[PDB]
Amino acid sequence: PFDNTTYKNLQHHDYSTYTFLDLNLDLSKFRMPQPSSGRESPRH
Amino acid sequence: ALFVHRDTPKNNPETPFDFTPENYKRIEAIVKNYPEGHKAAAVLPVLDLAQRQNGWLPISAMNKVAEILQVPPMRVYEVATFYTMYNRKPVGKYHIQVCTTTPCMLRNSDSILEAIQKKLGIKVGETTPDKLFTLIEVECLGACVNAPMVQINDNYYEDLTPKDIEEIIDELKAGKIPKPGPRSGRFSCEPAGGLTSLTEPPKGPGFGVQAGL
Amino acid sequence: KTSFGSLKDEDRIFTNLYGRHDWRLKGAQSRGDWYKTKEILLKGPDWILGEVKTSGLRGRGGAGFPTGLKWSFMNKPSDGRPKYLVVNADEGEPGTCKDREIIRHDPHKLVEGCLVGGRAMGARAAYIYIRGEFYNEASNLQVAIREAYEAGLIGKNACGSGYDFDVFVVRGAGAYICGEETALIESIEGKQGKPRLKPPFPADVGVFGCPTTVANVETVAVSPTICRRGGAWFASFGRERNSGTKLFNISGHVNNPCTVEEEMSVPLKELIEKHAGGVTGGWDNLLAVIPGGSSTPLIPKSVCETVLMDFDALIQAQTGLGTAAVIVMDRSTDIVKAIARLIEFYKHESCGQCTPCREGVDWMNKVMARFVRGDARPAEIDSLWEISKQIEGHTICALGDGAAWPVQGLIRHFRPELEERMQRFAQQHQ
Amino acid sequence: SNLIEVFVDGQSVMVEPGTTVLQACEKVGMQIPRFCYHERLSVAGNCRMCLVEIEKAPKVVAACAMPVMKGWNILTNSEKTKKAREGVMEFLLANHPLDCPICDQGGECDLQDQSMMFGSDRSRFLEGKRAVEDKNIGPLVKTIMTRCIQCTRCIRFASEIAGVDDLGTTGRGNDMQVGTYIEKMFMSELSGNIIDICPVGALTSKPYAFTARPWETRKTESIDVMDAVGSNIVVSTRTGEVMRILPRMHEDINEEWISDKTR
Numbered sequence A: 001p002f003d004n005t006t007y008k009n010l011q012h013h014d015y016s017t018y019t020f021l022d023l024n025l026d027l028s029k030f031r032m033p034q035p036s037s038g039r040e041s042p043r044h
Numbered sequence B: 001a002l003f004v005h006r007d008t009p010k011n012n013p014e015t016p017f018d019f020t021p022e023n024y025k026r027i028e029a030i031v032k033n034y035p036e037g038h039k040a041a042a043v044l045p046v047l048d049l050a051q052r053q054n055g056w057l058p059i060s061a062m063n064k065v066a067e068i069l070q071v072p073p074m075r076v077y078e079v080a081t082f083y084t085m086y087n088r089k090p091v092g093k094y095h096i097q098v099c100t101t102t103p104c105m106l107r108n109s110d111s112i113l114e115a116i117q118k119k120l121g122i123k124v125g126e127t128t129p130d131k132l133f134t135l136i137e138v139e140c141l142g143a144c145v146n147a148p149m150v151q152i153n154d155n156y157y158e159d160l161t162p163k164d165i166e167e168i169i170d171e172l173k174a175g176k177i178p179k180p181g182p183r184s185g186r187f188s189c190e191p192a193g194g195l196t197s198l199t200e201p202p203k204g205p206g207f208g209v210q211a212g213l
Numbered sequence C: 001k002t003s004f005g006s007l008k009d010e011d012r013i014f015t016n017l018y019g020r021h022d023w024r025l026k027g028a029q030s031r032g033d034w035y036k037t038k039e040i041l042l043k044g045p046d047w048i049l050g051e052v053k054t055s056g057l058r059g060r061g062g063a064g065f066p067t068g069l070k071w072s073f074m075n076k077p078s079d080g081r082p083k084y085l086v087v088n089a090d091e092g093e094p095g096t097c098k099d100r101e102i103i104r105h106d107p108h109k110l111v112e113g114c115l116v117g118g119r120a121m122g123a124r125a126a127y128i129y130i131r132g133e134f135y136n137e138a139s140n141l142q143v144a145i146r147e148a149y150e151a152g153l154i155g156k157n158a159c160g161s162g163y164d165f166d167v168f169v170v171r172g173a174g175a176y177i178c179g180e181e182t183a184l185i186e187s188i189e190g191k192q193g194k195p196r197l198k199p200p201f202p203a204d205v206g207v208f209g210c211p212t213t214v215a216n217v218e219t220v221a222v223s224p225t226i227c228r229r230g231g232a233w234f235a236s237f238g239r240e241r242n243s244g245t246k247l248f249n250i251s252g253h254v255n256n257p258c259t260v261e262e263e264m265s266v267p268l269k270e271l272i273e274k275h276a277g278g279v280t281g282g283w284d285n286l287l288a289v290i291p292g293g294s295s296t297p298l299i300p301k302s303v304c305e306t307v308l309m310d311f312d313a314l315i316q317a318q319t320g321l322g323t324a325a326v327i328v329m330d331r332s333t334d335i336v337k338a339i340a341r342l343i344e345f346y347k348h349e350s351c352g353q354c355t356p357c358r359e360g361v362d363w364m365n366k367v368m369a370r371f372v373r374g375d376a377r378p379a380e381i382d383s384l385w386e387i388s389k390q391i392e393g394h395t396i397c398a399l400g401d402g403a404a405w406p407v408q409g410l411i412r413h414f415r416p417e418l419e420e421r422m423q424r425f426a427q428q429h430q
Numbered sequence D: 001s002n003l004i005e006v007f008v009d010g011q012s013v014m015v016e017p018g019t020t021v022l023q024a025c026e027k028v029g030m031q032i033p034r035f036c037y038h039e040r041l042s043v044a045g046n047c048r049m050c051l052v053e054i055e056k057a058p059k060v061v062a063a064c065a066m067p068v069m070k071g072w073n074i075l076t077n078s079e080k081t082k083k084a085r086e087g088v089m090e091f092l093l094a095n096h097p098l099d100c101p102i103c104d105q106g107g108e109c110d111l112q113d114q115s116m117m118f119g120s121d122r123s124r125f126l127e128g129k130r131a132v133e134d135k136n137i138g139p140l141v142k143t144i145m146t147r148c149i150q151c152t153r154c155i156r157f158a159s160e161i162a163g164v165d166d167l168g169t170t171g172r173g174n175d176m177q178v179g180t181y182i183e184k185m186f187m188s189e190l191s192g193n194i195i196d197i198c199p200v201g202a203l204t205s206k207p208y209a210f211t212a213r214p215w216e217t218r219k220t221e222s223i224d225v226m227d228a229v230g231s232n233i234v235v236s237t238r239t240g241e242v243m244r245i246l247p248r249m250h251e252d253i254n255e256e257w258i259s260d261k262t263r
């Protein structure tokens, strides 16, 4: 039903100190390979 | 807060520090986020992860990051000293931060800071003797319509009063965690006298789309 | 049209701005998001840029640069280097909280805008830079990006269009100077937040030396709605060269501080009296209003009555729209202490690269502390005006102008108050 | 060819594409004041001394970095250019210590010379000056960081020519300090050139300290015999007594550097 009172952003009360990095680690298996500049480092 | 380091017995290059294997996996994901040839672009998140593991940055996480990412350690020192979110000194468990910019100073954040100071028995930049709190003064934190406000670790406590924030500190001293949000009748950012706008339901998909799309 | 204000709820782009509805993908698709995105990505980058140009959208970061031309600067064949969109969500300017609400409650609008903007200039990926202190907002954005990835809306074969586009989220480490575009580009690359010089523009050399476009969250999150509803619909609001709607953050000495979407040319008095509930103590108690956050000069009560809230109506009133953040100070405000606090804030958040800001912002901080205490003679008011003129226009980035402008506004509109405070201290001390 | 025509004070000169305003003014015979620009280090543009007013443009550009294009008129001695130079030098001398009589750079200081030539004549500063803690980088270079103006020639020389990567800028705002952040000795074979390229007396020569003054040393051009490179040098003496050895400009051997054994 149409609700205009209850706050629906209640997921962020259960965020630990590793949530962002674990989410990034989960996303790291969905992404395309990165382009390469032809050297491993700028000083190589 | 000095920008030069002296080798104390508690902070020396021989201080033991290393990443846990799951943190190594997160570090390798962070490195894989960036293009090849620019592995130095991951200095910020790996250093932040090292801080979240250790609680503070000695001079053993910086050289470990420099060895892992193959960069000169001077660049890691520059990055650590430039940014204010990197703790080069061991802070307490709860890092209280009170924002005293003009949009918060107009709504009397000084009363909140004074109440915290005379509750914990310390001053700005000082830690409790049992290493549980650390009170510093920061700039604007992006919640100016929720002024006054403080930030404790990753939690934003907004629309505070001296009695309410004294109760919040009491809750933290008992080991409990409070709810990171505004403490008045408002929920996130709406006016306290009800919704002036967006009282209509959203129209849903397919509304007002132009012809030919 | 000549009368502006009172935007209807059907015309507001940011539904669920207050967080009262579901912010996840089910809540996003029940409101209009991710609709006909395959057709948008298939109609062409030139078509998307033309729809943006016809809308008359200007940059909501604070510069007011026309977003159509700025996004059309990247429409060039690639020389082998990749091309990047970078969405900036640093939001370190005082008085501004709109982008935090956009990240927290509407992440799907942001990532749909990221996909559309990436198609508009042939970008390879998106690097959303978010503030270090916005941990829960960045986590919500990552959750929404994972939800979009798992449904195939972005990633490989994005929305069944054959376009390749990734979205990445990076986090800052507490530096306001990183909000600048070139400073953000340097901060992404693993360096300090020291801004580069122009030329080279980011369209030629940006992040990792690649072509890059830096765009605000508010100028990205409206692009799908512009491309769906139509450019002329977006250009039907506001005056000429001020087309569209805007998020306004009213804070300070007001009855109800709030973030509200509104038409562009709404009067400031109408905005305060309709959405903020009025000035604390009534409209007669008003002393000063900062129109666009701490970078823009203030205006007093007499000017503030009949000024529209757009770019031209404030430029002609020797101020700027900025981040459209209205800070209200009533008559109980020590305005000199507030401006001295602003100069102290600009003193702390300066990268120190180029010497006029690095020395003179501390100089104005010292003389403003002395002005607040009243320990001065009236000649250093004009000396401070000369110093602020010496900084404005001789720096690498625009933080020097953003620190010089409030001093000039305070001098110009409130020199008698400075003079009487200083002469009162001189009488009481000697 | 690809020569483009630019105007310096109304005088037309030909320049290659990509040439900065500073190099064009040097081609016509004008020397733009500069602090952070060196012809062999990378372009930094963080001292704002080289600001010059291109006509029909209401914003001064940095001559050390901005390239010229066709039809640009460069007003090198206009009113707003001089005002910009005076303001930049006022900001530079706001926090400088009154250490000229105790300085080894006195009489050969770049800052003193272009303050006499392009700066103003008196001070409006009235507050307390800053103070920077002095660092130790070795028994070759004497370091007094209260006099450093953060020109970042240290970092560029150690990162591009010496190739050591041991100098950096730690801090933010007015409290930014050029240093090594730890007790580390900058020991390379080219560690006197940072003394050479420091525009102020922050990095001076430790063996030369408090011995002579530049206006009295007789300069005699000679050849280094320490190595087989054949570096051209200047021996500066004082009353029949060798005081110090400086490099000579010679683009074919030792462009403006020498090894510290020679020095």
Ligand SMILES: NC(=O)C1=CN([C@@H]2O[C@H](COP(=O)(O)OP(=O)(O)OC[C@H]3O[C@@H](n4cnc5c(N)ncnc54)[C@H](O)[C@@H]3O)[C@@H](O)[C@H]2O)C=CC1
Residues within 6 Å of the ligand: C059, C060, C061, C062, C063, C064, C065, C070, C073, C091, C092, C093, C096, C179, C181, C201, C202, C203, C214, C295, C296, C320, C322, C323, C397, C398, C402
């Ligand atoms: N939103 C915020 O949090 C803050 C906003 N501001 C506002 O930001 C503004 C200053 O920012 P800037 O980025 O310096 O503004 P503006 O000088 O740069 O230009 C805005 C954008 O247009 C591009 N651009 C401009 N001319 C161009 C050209 N000829 N060719 C190619 N690209 C071109 C720039 O690269 C930039 O991305 C002020 O209005 C200030 O009030 C200031 C501080 C904080």
Ligand SMILES: Cc1cc2nc3c(=O)[nH]c(=O)nc-3n(C[C@H](O)[C@H](O)[C@H](O)COP(=O)(O)O)c2cc1C
Residues within 6 Å of the ligand: C058, C059, C060, C061, C062, C063, C064, C065, C067, C070, C088, C089, C090, C091, C092, C093, C176, C177, C178, C179, C180, C181, C214, C215, C216, C217, C219, C397, C398, C399
């Ligand atoms: C010191 C400084 C801080 C800035 N911070 C922000 C910011 O936090 N968010 C923002 O959108 N623009 C900020 N800007 C403005 C940007 O330089 C740039 O105008 C903006 O990121 C993109 O503008 P656009 O809306 O046309 O895309 C800042 C500028 C300066 C000089």
Ligand code: SF4
Residues within 6 Å of the ligand: C177, C194, C195, C349, C350, C351, C352, C353, C354, C355, C357, C358, C395, C396, C397, C398, C399, C400
């Ligand atoms: S004006 Fe200040 S913040 Fe901007 S580049 Fe110069 S020193 Fe840095």
Ligand code: SF4
Residues within 6 Å of the ligand: D096, D097, D098, D099, D100, D103, D104, D105, D106, D107, D109, D110, D111, D112, D147, D199, D200, D201, D202
């Ligand atoms: S470096 Fe130059 S200006 Fe500074 S004290 Fe020495 S001689 Fe004087």
Ligand code: SF4
Residues within 6 Å of the ligand: D147, D148, D149, D150, D151, D152, D153, D154, D155, D178, D194, D197, D198, D199, D200, D202, D203
């Ligand atoms: S010590 Fe000298 S050369 Fe080094 S950064 Fe400072 S002024 Fe420049």
Ligand code: FES
Residues within 6 Å of the ligand: B099, B100, B101, B102, B103, B104, B139, B140, B141, B142, B143, B144, B147, B149, C093, C094, C095, C096
């Ligand atoms: S001024 Fe305090 S949160 Fe912005």
Ligand code: FES
Residues within 6 Å of the ligand: D033, D034, D035, D036, D037, D044, D045, D046, D047, D048, D049, D050, D051, D062, D063, D064, D065
């Ligand atoms: S010489 Fe150009 S800014 Fe320093």
Ligand SMILES: [K+]
Residues within 6 Å of the ligand: D105, D194, D195, D196, D197, D198, D199, D200, D201, D202, D203, D204
């Ligand atoms: K020197």
